[PDB]
Amino acid sequence: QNLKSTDRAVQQMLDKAKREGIQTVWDRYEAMKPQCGFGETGLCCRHCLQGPCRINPFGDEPKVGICGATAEVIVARGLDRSIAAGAAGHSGHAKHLAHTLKKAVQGKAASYMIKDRTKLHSIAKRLGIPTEGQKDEDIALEVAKAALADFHEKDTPVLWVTTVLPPSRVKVLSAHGLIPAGIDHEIAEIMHRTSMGCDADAQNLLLGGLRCSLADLAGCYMGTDLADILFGTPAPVVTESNLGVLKADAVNVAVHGHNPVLSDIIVSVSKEMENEARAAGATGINVVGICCTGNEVLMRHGIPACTHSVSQEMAMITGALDAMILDYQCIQPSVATIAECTGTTVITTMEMSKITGATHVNFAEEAAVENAKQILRLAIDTFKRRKGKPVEIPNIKTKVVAGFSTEAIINALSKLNANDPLKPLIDNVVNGNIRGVCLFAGCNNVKVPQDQNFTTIARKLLKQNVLVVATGCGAGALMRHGFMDPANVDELCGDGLKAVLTAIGEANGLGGPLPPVLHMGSCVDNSRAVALVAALANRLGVDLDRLPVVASAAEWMHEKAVAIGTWAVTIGLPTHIGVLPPITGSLPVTQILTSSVKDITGGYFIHELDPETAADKLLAAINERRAGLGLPW
Amino acid sequence: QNLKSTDRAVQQMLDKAKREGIQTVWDRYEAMKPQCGFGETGLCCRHCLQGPCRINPFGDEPKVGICGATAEVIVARGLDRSIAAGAAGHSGHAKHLAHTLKKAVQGKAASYMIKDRTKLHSIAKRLGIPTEGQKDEDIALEVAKAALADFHEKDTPVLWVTTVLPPSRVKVLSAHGLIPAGIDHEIAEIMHRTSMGCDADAQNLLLGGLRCSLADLAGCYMGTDLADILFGTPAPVVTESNLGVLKADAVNVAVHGHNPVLSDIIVSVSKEMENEARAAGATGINVVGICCTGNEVLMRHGIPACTHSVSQEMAMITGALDAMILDYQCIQPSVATIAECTGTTVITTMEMSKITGATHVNFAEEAAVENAKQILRLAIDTFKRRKGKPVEIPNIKTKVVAGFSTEAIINALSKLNANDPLKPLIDNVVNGNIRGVCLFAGCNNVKVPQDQNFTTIARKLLKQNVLVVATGCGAGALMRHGFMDPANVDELCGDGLKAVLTAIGEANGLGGPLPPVLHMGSCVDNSRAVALVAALANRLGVDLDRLPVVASAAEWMHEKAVAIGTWAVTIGLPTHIGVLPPITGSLPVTQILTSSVKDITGGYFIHELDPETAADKLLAAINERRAGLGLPW
Numbered sequence A, B: 001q002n003l004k005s006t007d008r009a010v011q012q013m014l015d016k017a018k019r020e021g022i023q024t025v026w027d028r029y030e031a032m033k034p035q036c037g038f039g040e041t042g043l044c045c046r047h048c049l050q051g052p053c054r055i056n057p058f059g060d061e062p063k064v065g066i067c068g069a070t071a072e073v074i075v076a077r078g079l080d081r082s083i084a085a086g087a088a089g090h091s092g093h094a095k096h097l098a099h100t101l102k103k104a105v106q107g108k109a110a111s112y113m114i115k116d117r118t119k120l121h122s123i124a125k126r127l128g129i130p131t132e133g134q135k136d137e138d139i140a141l142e143v144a145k146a147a148l149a150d151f152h153e154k155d156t157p158v159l160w161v162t163t164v165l166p167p168s169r170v171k172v173l174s175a176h177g178l179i180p181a182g183i184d185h186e187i188a189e190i191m192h193r194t195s196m197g198c199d200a201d202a203q204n205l206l207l208g209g210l211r212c213s214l215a216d217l218a219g220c221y222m223g224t225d226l227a228d229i230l231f232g233t234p235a236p237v238v239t240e241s242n243l244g245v246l247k248a249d250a251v252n253v254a255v256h257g258h259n260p261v262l263s264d265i266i267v268s269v270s271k272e273m274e275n276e277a278r279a280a281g282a283t284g285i286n287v288v289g290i291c292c293t294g295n296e297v298l299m300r301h302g303i304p305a306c307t308h309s310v311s312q313e314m315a316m317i318t319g320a321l322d323a324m325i326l327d328y329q330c331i332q333p334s335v336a337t338i339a340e341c342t343g344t345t346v347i348t349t350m351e352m353s354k355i356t357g358a359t360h361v362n363f364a365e366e367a368a369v370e371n372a373k374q375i376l377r378l379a380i381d382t383f384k385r386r387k388g389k390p391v392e393i394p395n396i397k398t399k400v401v402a403g404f405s406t407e408a409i410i411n412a413l414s415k416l417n418a419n420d421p422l423k424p425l426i427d428n429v430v431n432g433n434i435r436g437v438c439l440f441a442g443c444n445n446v447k448v449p450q451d452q453n454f455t456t457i458a459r460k461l462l463k464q465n466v467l468v469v470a471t472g473c474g475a476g477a478l479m480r481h482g483f484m485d486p487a488n489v490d491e492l493c494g495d496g497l498k499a500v501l502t503a504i505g506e507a508n509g510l511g512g513p514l515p516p517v518l519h520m521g522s523c524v525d526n527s528r529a530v531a532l533v534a535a536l537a538n539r540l541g542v543d544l545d546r547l548p549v550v551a552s553a554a555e556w557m558h559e560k561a562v563a564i565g566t567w568a569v570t571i572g573l574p575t576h577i578g579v580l581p582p583i584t585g586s587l588p589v590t591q592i593l594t595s596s597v598k599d600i601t602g603g604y605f606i607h608e609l610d611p612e613t614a615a616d617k618l619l620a621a622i623n624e625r626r627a628g629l630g631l632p633w
């Protein structure tokens, strides 16, 4: 079972699932083997009814698609469509928040409101919306309107790209025609240009993909901006993670999916309705997080994280999960089937994301509180139905310190230098205490034993004094293995990095260091790491492709993460990926993405499946950046 | 070779290509066999890096995707993405025209202009834009702005759906939540909802697809509206088709692709520069059409149609095609490779549609005339390089009467009844002279011997007194086999239909009947057939799903045609398709699309590969509609 997951709590429930005959994602993966090699290499195309077409990676025919499409064209078209799908997912999430803010400040969704006035005002100034002399509800309405405007063509390009990156970076991107004109405009243009009998030039295709990946960055950043306005900018918090955060005695309610517009309300209302859970014989309502919406409520409210990504079914297998509350993205549809065996009430809430067999509760922002009550009452009723039934919650959990927004990181640094808060961090980069910065992002993937790449690469980089920040299921993987607990700084961190984490933590009145890894939030909160690295770049007067900053999507899965890794490359970062995407069937495409894209953006993909080697290659990329600045390494 | 194409001119060049060793689409198809059965049935998914996943249509594992996605979910997700890609293609075409009109009436593209004032004004009134008291350049600017606005969310739904369909049809669609909110908004929402771990309910998924197919209808209709404003509403014209329209002595220039913003300029300028072709020893500049942009210039200017779709390489094989001028969609990328052997200069002109090996001439509307000259001069130079070289143009051509816009059809009918022009057509429907109406649309497909379904179904329906209208490569197939020549009315048409075509033609001062099939234009001009059938529905006070009107995508290929067939079903038509899309791996999905969608929209797909049976099934659907009106059949 340790070949399936490195998580001991996950291993325990794989054993339960096996003896109870419940099929798991790993069983379904086993049943899928050997997987198709055409699809695995990218040498397959179904973009018209003359297909499916395939190309032998080596040997005799077929060598070309029926229409004449080459291996490099087919491979670039499929990758482009992946980026556009990811962009669409982050786009719909941000759009949802934009509509919610608009409804809130027009008196239509009274359950929502401007909770962060400081963020609202700083966003308006970033965008050049006037603050002085304007009411907050009118500033917010203007900000919401500008968010919605970035989805279509207009007189300006996408502001959630051009106002968030260093200006030298925007200039370099504009010179190559890479600045998105509108978020949904780029998505549609990708779908067009990759359809049959359109764009048939690998380089042209890939440049379109880089541009669309910046449409995804825009959606992430606007998702983060809007969620902070509506729900508060995260600040450091302490909580726990892994399955041991379930309580046999309480009504265990999982928020699962991505968008907090729903889950943030569930958190708030659950607190009020906890007298009503006691009436049914539970201690209360134990709200726990799964996947990114769990990260959202962990980052803002300290909701404990139950589990993540590939292992999400395992929360159900305990027998104690009374309800799983879904919006969209990364929900294994199997949870609807597994619920028949575990008793869990699975509830979908968004019109465009239903699962056959799951209870659907239409959720409307105008009636959010009533909807949350109806859903929490279904959870209460399910906990009743399992009173007396035996549960197996693995007694396994870790301590998690999280909530490291870019605002919170800068504020923490400000305690060392009040008027130049980035200077102490840069000072320790220059003197070697911080070797560089690595962002871990993305998913788990059934192809990789869960968390194995994340923890192995992280252990090695931390020893080498790398400041590690993490998001999404990368943060989930690290937090479930102890990397967000300050008690592990001595074991995990190098002396230089420990010095820095200790100085900052003690200067923030903690008596202890910062945790070994800084949790910066959900997948859209990859935008927070951009905001930080862009702030570092601007204080130093250099572009991102000169900073000792790298990224690792060490176990990635979703089209969203493909878009993120592409925009990490596009904004100039060396970007390690731990599962090969379907590109190896074209050497020219692989070469563009791993080498010659350096000449355009300064970033590049690092393909490396073995995580020890991956850590070496990431350190090498960090140290090459150090040298280009004339720094010791 | 007659197993490859029923076109005798195409057969002749297949023989030339074979002996010269030039590989063709049919050779590439042969080399692709046996094609993958997972993809053919739709039981394959690559929407995340845990894939590729497949499902055995029958038997043992794999039975489900790794994430738990069922066969019905995988099949519905892939179909949805096809509709969105088609919608994106018609969207980008319409968007292009919208930007051109805006530039034209703002003094930025002086090569363009309001050529059809009547169409401009009637569009403004359809949309409720004010005409009386307004300048034309200001009405047009308002119309262009409303076109661009329909791509994103706003206070109104997509007007190029809600103002073009019968109001009872809009009401039925709204009740099911099927009205698009914005064109690129629906495209992005499809891409989101079909990504991993989102929508996992076949019915929910398919309803999203119907809605996105109406976003495609909107793009088609707005493409037709804008092209008519800018370039003129088509009116009846006479010209020729097939390879025999090439002339060994002239500079033969093919316009190929979809968007006339480019090709309409090529037509105009080529006329001026024909003294300059004589200086190089050609009789002139023979502009000919391929695919839909050829239909556009055929419909408006009587440019002869060279060939279409699957057989487009064959124009090159003659040796006399000096240049092929491309914008996007349905261009086999093989033309760039074949040009090395035939001498043809292949020229791409749009930034997002390049082919490796082809000459790229950036085309800008602000400099359209200079660009057209540079391109026509390359054609002139290539004709020089082949003086003395021997050519093999098959001496095969047909007479084509075309240009039957809905305006032109109504005007022609008006000569029989000036104040109630639709009444004579309805009168002959009621009395049986016209059994019903069939639209042929879509592509050729290498899987079907070229034109075989189109001509066989058409021959049978015309004998049974069906009024046949046709667009795109369906019109191409019919026109290359003589169905647009009035001299064939006696052989092809039934006595009732002949009576009607004769009465209308003679009343329009022709001494002869209308041609056996009415050519209504390019693929986006499928919107013209909607406008006609909606006008018929409104005059009768019934919805489209009560009219004896059907459609046949008899040889379809492109994601665009998948979107068109879906919106034909969505607006209420029985819709025959001659190549199975990848859905047969899910009985529940096949059942929705072929039967139970009747209960939602009144339309339904008719899957039928054998064209004789297809004609029987189409007649049965027409006759069932007749009966529901209490009409004799």
Ligand code: SF4
Residues within 6 Å of the ligand: A045, A046, A047, A048, A049, A050, A051, A052, A053, A065, A066, A067, A068, A069, A074, A195, A196, A197
């Ligand atoms: S687009 Fe070309 S390569 Fe793809 S399925 Fe169609 S014919 Fe084959």
Ligand code: SF4
Residues within 6 Å of the ligand: B045, B046, B047, B048, B049, B050, B051, B052, B053, B065, B066, B067, B068, B069, B074, B195, B196, B197
């Ligand atoms: S989305 Fe599901 S079915 Fe598709 S490739 Fe990923 S795991 Fe497989």
Ligand code: FES
Residues within 6 Å of the ligand: A036, A037, A038, A039, A040, A044, A045, A052, A054, B036, B039, B044, B046, B052
């Ligand atoms: S041939 Fe297997 S992914 Fe298409």
Ligand code: FES
Residues within 6 Å of the ligand: A036, A039, A044, A046, A052, B036, B037, B038, B039, B040, B044, B045, B052, B054
């Ligand atoms: S298994 Fe062949 S299309 Fe994927």
Ligand SMILES: [Fe+3]
Residues within 6 Å of the ligand: A290, A291, A292, A308, A309, A330, A443, A473
């Ligand atoms: Fe996740």
Ligand SMILES: [Fe+3]
Residues within 6 Å of the ligand: B290, B291, B292, B308, B309, B330, B443, B473
């Ligand atoms: Fe065509």
